[PDB]
Design an enzyme around this catalytic site. Structure first.
Site, PDB file in Angstrom:
ATOM      1  N   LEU A   1      56.251  59.476  53.151  1.00  0.00           N
ATOM      2  CA  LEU A   1      55.128  60.213  53.356  1.00  0.00           C
ATOM      3  C   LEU A   1      55.413  61.696  53.882  1.00  0.00           C
ATOM      4  O   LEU A   1      55.092  61.866  55.162  1.00  0.00           O
ATOM      5  CB  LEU A   1      54.210  59.612  54.054  1.00  0.00           C
TER       6      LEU A   1
ATOM      7  N   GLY B   1      54.513  64.105  49.734  1.00  0.00           N
ATOM      8  CA  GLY B   1      54.230  62.794  49.440  1.00  0.00           C
ATOM      9  C   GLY B   1      52.707  62.248  50.067  1.00  0.00           C
ATOM     10  O   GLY B   1      51.960  61.378  49.538  1.00  0.00           O
TER      11      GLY B   1
ATOM     12  N   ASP C   1      57.046  53.480  53.707  1.00  0.00           N
ATOM     13  CA  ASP C   1      57.695  54.296  54.177  1.00  0.00           C
ATOM     14  C   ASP C   1      59.251  53.687  54.912  1.00  0.00           C
ATOM     15  O   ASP C   1      59.391  52.551  55.208  1.00  0.00           O
ATOM     16  CB  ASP C   1      57.356  55.424  55.236  1.00  0.00           C
TER      17      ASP C   1
ATOM     18  N   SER D   1      54.488  70.680  42.228  1.00  0.00           N
ATOM     19  CA  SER D   1      54.311  72.104  42.937  1.00  0.00           C
ATOM     20  C   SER D   1      53.261  72.388  43.539  1.00  0.00           C
ATOM     21  O   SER D   1      52.191  71.928  43.201  1.00  0.00           O
ATOM     22  CB  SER D   1      54.702  73.377  41.697  1.00  0.00           C
TER      23      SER D   1
ATOM     24  N   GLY E   1      52.988  72.912  47.211  1.00  0.00           N
ATOM     25  CA  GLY E   1      53.195  72.643  48.481  1.00  0.00           C
ATOM     26  C   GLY E   1      51.896  72.524  49.504  1.00  0.00           C
ATOM     27  O   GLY E   1      51.349  71.758  49.596  1.00  0.00           O
TER      28      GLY E   1
ATOM     29  N   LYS F   1      60.137  72.120  35.883  1.00  0.00           N
ATOM     30  CA  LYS F   1      59.752  72.570  37.594  1.00  0.00           C
ATOM     31  C   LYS F   1      61.042  73.239  37.943  1.00  0.00           C
ATOM     32  O   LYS F   1      60.744  74.367  38.765  1.00  0.00           O
ATOM     33  CB  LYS F   1      59.580  71.489  38.240  1.00  0.00           C
TER      34      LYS F   1
ATOM     35  N   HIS G   1      60.562  76.559  36.717  1.00  0.00           N
ATOM     36  CA  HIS G   1      59.624  77.295  37.338  1.00  0.00           C
ATOM     37  C   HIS G   1      60.260  77.914  38.560  1.00  0.00           C
ATOM     38  O   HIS G   1      59.786  78.822  39.238  1.00  0.00           O
ATOM     39  CB  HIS G   1      58.441  76.214  37.622  1.00  0.00           C
ATOM     40  N   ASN G   2      61.058  76.932  39.453  1.00  0.00           N
ATOM     41  CA  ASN G   2      61.513  77.367  40.614  1.00  0.00           C
ATOM     42  C   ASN G   2      62.453  78.560  40.257  1.00  0.00           C
ATOM     43  O   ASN G   2      62.519  79.694  41.141  1.00  0.00           O
ATOM     44  CB  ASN G   2      62.172  76.406  41.216  1.00  0.00           C
TER      45      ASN G   2
ATOM     46  N   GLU H   1      59.977  81.885  39.962  1.00  0.00           N
ATOM     47  CA  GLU H   1      59.552  81.932  41.332  1.00  0.00           C
ATOM     48  C   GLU H   1      60.601  82.740  42.145  1.00  0.00           C
ATOM     49  O   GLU H   1      60.341  83.850  42.619  1.00  0.00           O
ATOM     50  CB  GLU H   1      59.320  80.709  41.964  1.00  0.00           C
ATOM     51  N   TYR H   2      61.762  82.249  42.147  1.00  0.00           N
ATOM     52  CA  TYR H   2      62.724  83.074  43.085  1.00  0.00           C
ATOM     53  C   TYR H   2      62.692  84.480  42.571  1.00  0.00           C
ATOM     54  O   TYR H   2      62.690  85.765  43.169  1.00  0.00           O
ATOM     55  CB  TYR H   2      64.281  82.529  42.782  1.00  0.00           C
TER      56      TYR H   2
END
Lengths: 333, 323, 331, 323
Positions: D6, D10, D28, D120, D122, D188, D191-192, D195-196
């Site tokens: 979590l 998560g 967990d 993605s 956040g 993804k 995608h990252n 993004e950078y």
């Protein structure tokens, strides 16, 4: 023949010595007269303390060579020589002058009937015995007239075997000097020579760094296949081995081999690298011409980051990375 | 002494002939006779059509050199030797093997008594006379056994004045060959050698290009057309840089030759291959967190020259149509 | 308020129309009386046949907007606007002019007492209906004096939700316009605007190409180890779509990207040769004088060069070296 | 379905999942965690992997978002013995898309399925939704698609794409079955990468502006210092770009926020980590021959910001001293 030298720095001096050894009559001045008396001791030192004095102890037509710091101080000197010299004389600026400045200087002294020969000089400390690669631009006839000085201070064909396909008579290029074209073309070519300098040293340095960290699997991002990166290389011996029989044979590797052997870990050296700015001009020319030059421009951009000039951009990343992802800046090692 | 040689290309053949004038015994074989056939009893040279004919042909320890095109061809050879070679014989892989594949090749051989020395071979097509710079990995006693060969192929210390501070006796490093560490480390160093090589080439390629277009004012607006008026004689600049300058190098020497043959390099397409060592060096850099823009940018320039940016250029074109 | 507009290309003609509908009286001039005439029917607008007559009709102090091809055409308009205009009048340069060029225009107009407002204008065609993001350098009173026009041409803070951290009487920046500083500031920031634009373009483009060739293990020069790892055929237009909400890479460009890929999934009809403005070049020059590392921006600019084959002699020199030391052929 | 681990991600998934309406069972390694379950709303925990496995029916579907690496793999090998066949496990961790291929093989050995998930969004994901890219089986995906649409932001988050007429497709939703195994994580990753590059671009431009006053603060000798004497209100330049221009983007709005809070961004040091998926994007470009200098140099700027250029700099410094 007979020559005058304004400015006696580590480079101004070693040319008058290489010339006096080559059978030429030298006259000289630097503002600091403890350096003007330094030479007075040597063959044809012919020390002097006046621009007028100088123009005096030399007989026209005369040729004077200038190697003082680039920027205001250089132009300052050409200013004077605009007076101090007669018409039909010759001005050789071997300083690290910007080629666009050579066009104003050519302007000015043309009015007084002087010729400006712009000499891009490279070579370092070794050049007093090895010789300097000279890249010269300017008026064709005034190059002919000063060519004896270039030929003497260049290393000479003996310094390296002839290139295959070179035919019969030795061309100036094979001697180590070259009339690259009209005014400014000599400094222009030397400028690009320093840009290539940067690109080659970065290629060596980056490679060395890849070797250096090939042990990363022994020792955030997870590393897949750390069984692969488990090598501790001998960077001084790989550098040495590459000096013969490989494709990257070069002076710079030779120099890097020496440095690695004195200090295998380069531990005492600064991680802060400077740029001359000639590398800056080389990058700006490339942009102006639409020539893509990522390899040279990044090598130069790697120096900027080594001086933490990327500071603000870095904080902007950490600022972005924080706000979308709660990402933390990790503490210093 | 003696050794085997599988593959007789521009490289394998020429190291054999430098091996022979050195007093070694070679057993040439290439999946083509026309090649093996090509070597007509070259001094110390005998042709077989058998790996088996090949193995048994000479004494234990049974060891020899393989110079075959990298990939499964290398592997496909390196299984056959499994089925042969007895034990205690070490295979010298001088080809352009990905060092990761060296690890699988060595263990596969471990399931036998066979040693594996991975040798990163440099020098190109100048090597018959000039010598080949060599970077080998694997076992130090296995290397010790084959060392007389490595010294003969290498250029020998005489090829360049010794480093200032090198005192006493010539080291391996000084003679043009070096044992770099365990298996893979040989081809690992030479993989990086080609990475550095891409960046030196590109450094001088881009520079010549800047010079070549300095005449821009005479022919994206340009201010100061009066600052770009130069028609440089690139063949002459390239050879002036040979003497008394910082950027001297064998690559500059070869560049000088080519411009003397062709002042516009008109014969060359501009479509530049890459054989893989440059890419492996860029991946190694990325996995190590070592920033290598100068080397990697040089690789990426080679990709672009093959029009591999085309889909991205299309995307750029399609974006600007919208605004 | 009352304004002059010189030249009528799509940009210059649309600023005119965004202004006259915003309640500003517009007096238009152009080289081409055809172009002048198209602005005669428009509400609140009036044509001219000479710069003398232009200023005859503007009550000094006057404000004249110049929107003309950058470089030698811009300089010429300004040079005789030195004659047509009296002291205290202001010249807005909205064209794509080099900020260093704004330095000589400021001095050439102050001699006659004319302020030069340099205005970097962005946004393209949607600005006529959605507003142009404006960046203005020059004198602060002259700016305050001519601010009603910048305000009207801008999109207006309605165009974007306000920033968390701002609250109150709206600052000029949230209008879509801003006073950057002394003369040249507006074109300076606007040139870096384009540099960033090239950076983001390129990032998307490279990103999409990486997807496009994930299928590189199916099709089979460098041996690709681990071919099985590259066996995907990706639906690029849907991938660009999905990214449009919920990701970090949301952007007006990715929006256009999604549109473009919906019309043509393989961009088959599009050109692989990509031209560059010149501001992207100005940006990279600026970064090098400042000592600012800008590999991402500049390498995006340089990719553009290579797409117009400007990398060619460099490539020939690589191949020439390769044949010397390796006997390598070109495929 | 349940959730293993979590973290910031998560957990806010299952806070968004339950408010959405499904019921999740929580787990967990650290029971010290479990701030939930207050209810947990529509959420009830467990104290063992075993306890959860025999739970919530046999149509087994569990979602893992525990840090990638070997801690992931252990969960899947455990979850192999503890799930029965027909139940498929969703992985939303930042797992190398290659790690998924052993796992999805590992799992169909015992009849468990896997679905790679690229997650993605956040610390905004809760109220804004998490863009998901999912790889795996077409029916296993279809059974789980209820989970994904309440997890994703929903088509309402942004205007429909002009020219998309007809009914809503999942991509407009914020989720999509990218293809077979590994494909979800692959997207993804890229995608990252993008993004950078997008923030390096903005970051570099801001730096340019930040230092447009080098002609006042007075390494090369700067020509034309008059050309560089500008002090820019960086937090306003940021803002004004948000309306009416081309670089409009979410990364700008967050950059405009941070600069409004912190005008000089002092609370950030400059040390920028990289989770790894930028690296794999760059390595995938190099395996595919795709030139990606803009993205690969953005990542190298991060590397240098952690002082990983260090040895190369010592090297350049040692070379210069030799002149």
């Amino acid at each position: 023949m007979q020559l005058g030298m304004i400015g006696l720095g580590r480079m101004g001096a070693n040319i008058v010595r290489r010339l006096a050894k080559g059978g030429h009559d030298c006259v000289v001045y630097d503002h600091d007269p403890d350096a003007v008396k330094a030479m007075a001791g040597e063959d044809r030192t012919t020390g002097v303390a006046s621009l007028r004095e100088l123009s005096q102890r030399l007989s026209a037509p005369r040729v004077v060579w200038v190697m003082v710091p680039a920027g205001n101080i250089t132009t300052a000197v050409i200013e004077e020589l605009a007076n101090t010299l007669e018409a039909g004389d010759i001005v050789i600026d071997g300083g690290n002058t910007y080629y666009r400045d050579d066009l104003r200087h050519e302007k000015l002294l043309f009015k007084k009937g002087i010729h400006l020969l712009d000499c891009g000089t490279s070579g370092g400390v070794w050049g007093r015995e090895r010789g300097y690669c000279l890249m010269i631009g300017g008026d064709g006839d005034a190059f002919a007239r000063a060519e004896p000085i270039f030929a003497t201070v260049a290393p000479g064909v003996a310094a390296a075997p002839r290139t295959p396909g070179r035919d019969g008579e030795v061309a100036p290029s094979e001697q180590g000097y070259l009339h690259c074209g009209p005014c400014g073309s000599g400094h222009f070519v030397k400028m690009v020579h320093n840009g290539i300098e940067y690109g080659m040293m970065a290629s060596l340095a980056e490679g060395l760094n890849i070797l250096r960290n090939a042990d990363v699997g022994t020792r955030t991002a997870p590393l897949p296949n750390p069984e692969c990166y488990q090598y501790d290389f001998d960077i001084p011996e790989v550098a040495e081995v590459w000096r013969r029989g490989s494709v990257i044979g070069s002076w710079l590797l030779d120099l890097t081999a020496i440095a690695l052997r004195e200090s295998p870990d380069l531990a005492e050296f600064s991680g802060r690298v400077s740029d001359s700015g000639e590398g800056r001009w080389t990058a700006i020319a490339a942009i102006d011409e639409g020539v893509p030059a990522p390899v040279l421009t990044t090598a130069l951009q790697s120096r900027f980051a080594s001086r933490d000039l990327d500071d603000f951009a870095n904080k902007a990343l950490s600022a972005m990375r924080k706000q979308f992802g709660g990402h933390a800046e990790k503490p210093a090692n």
